[PDB]
Design a protein around this ligand. Structure first.
Ligand SMILES: [Zn+2]
Ligand SMILES: [Zn+2]
Lengths: 50, 47, 49, 67
């Protein structure tokens, strides 16, 4: 729900105002997923990793 | 001590890897395995 | 008399309120009255609609 | 993914009528008929069930199942 009107001071050129109750209820919940991969191999000799 | 239990992604069978073994499954021919969830107690926030 | 418009207290123009205030009196009085408007106008505009 | 338990704007519990809304859409009822028969009257707590996608149903087909 959007209300096109000026508020106290925080809708300057592109700023938008949020609702604390709505944010607590869960409007706009995001999740980030990062990958961490590691490969491990042998060598031409009999040396190894552990 | 306790053999590390691992689950597969095709048959989901909980097997164990002993030491420096070919990483595969004893039921199917799938070459990728997964891990179980920890048995500790993690606290979460409901705020 | 008169209503304040873009030519009276606007940015990029002469014969400005804060400009004349800084030219006549000291420069410290120009900055103390620039934030007083930003606390008077917006609240009234928000309560007006 | 899942229907929200409460509304975002007011905070009315809208998560206890999703299955009822689904079961009422198969009794030859119009979307508006189901929405005004369930109990929703205003529109802030009405688009929670109207405009809602169900992706956990498609996400359970890829979920691990026991053999
Ligand atoms: Zn398997
Ligand atoms: Zn509502």
């Amino acid at each position: 729900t959007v209300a096109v009107m000026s508020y106290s001071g925080y809708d300057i050129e592109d700023a938008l105002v949020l609702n604390k109750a709505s944010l607590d209820r869960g409007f706009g919940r995001c999740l980030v997923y990062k990958n961490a991969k590691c490969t491990l191999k042998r060598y031409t000799n009999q040396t190894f990793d552990k | 001590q306790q053999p590390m239990i691992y689950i597969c992604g095709e048959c989901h069978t909980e097997n164990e890897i002993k030491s420096r073994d070919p990483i595969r499954c004893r039921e199917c021919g799938y070459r990728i395995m997964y891990k179980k969830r920890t048995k500790r107690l993690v606290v979460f926030d409901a705020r | 008399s008169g209503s304040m418009d873009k030519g009276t207290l606007g940015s990029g123009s002469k014969n400005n309120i804060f400009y004349i205030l800084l030219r006549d009196w000291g420069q410290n009085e120009a900055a103390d009255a620039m934030s007083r408007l930003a606390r008077l106008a917006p609240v009234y505009l928000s309560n007006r609609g | 993914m899942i229907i929200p338990v409460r509304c975002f704007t007011c905070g009315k519990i809208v998560g206890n009528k999703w299955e009822a809304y689904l079961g009422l859409l198969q009794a030859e009822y119009t979307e508006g008929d189901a929405l005004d028969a369930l109990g929703l009257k205003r529109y802030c707590c009405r688009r929670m069930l109207l405009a809602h996608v169900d992706l956990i149903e498609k996400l359970l087909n890829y979920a691990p199942l026991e053999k």
